[PDB]
């Protein structure tokens, strides 16, 4: 229905604002853009489903996110990669995981403060009647 599309049109809205204020985050400069394979070329062969905030943005434009919990498994996928890449003890290594720590907390705190718990249900039950 068109209230539906209304629905979908304020999700992709919330999420597109939400991305934004991470990608202007200094700290999080390292997840904008997908790693560059002349400086990582191991990266494409470890990490098996790479993610970044301008892909994120991507998916938002592609229709990808019917619901914040699925915009979210996206976040904590930049996250868990970062720690699955970067596990030494290395402090190149400890900053990355603390930054990619800190984006997945930030866009959580930013969610829990600003998305309307009634809004996120109505998207999942638009989603789960398709
Ligand atoms: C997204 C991303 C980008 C990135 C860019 C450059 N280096 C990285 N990691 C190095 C691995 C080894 C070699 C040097 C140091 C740091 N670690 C010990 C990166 N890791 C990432 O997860």
């Not at 892909?55 to 996110?65: G, M, P, Q």
Request: charged fraction near 35%.
């Amino acid at each position: 229905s068109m209230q539906e599309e209304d629905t979908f049109r304020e999700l992709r809205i919330f999420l597109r604002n939400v991305t934004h204020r991470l990608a202007i985050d200094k700290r999080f400069r390292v997840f904008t853009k997908p790693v560059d394979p002349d400086e990582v070329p191991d990266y494409v062969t470890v990490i098996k489903q790479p993610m970044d905030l301008s892909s994120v943005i991507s998916k938002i434009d592609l229709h990808k996110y019917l619901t914040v919990k699925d915009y979210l498994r996206d976040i904590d996928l930049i996250c868990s990669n970062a720690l699955e890449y970067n596990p030494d003890r290395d402090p190149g290594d400890r900053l990355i995981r603390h930054r990619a720590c800190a984006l997945r907390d930030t866009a959580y705190a930013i969610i829990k403060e600003e998305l309307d718990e009634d809004f996120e249900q109505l998207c999942e039950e638009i989603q789960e009647s398709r």
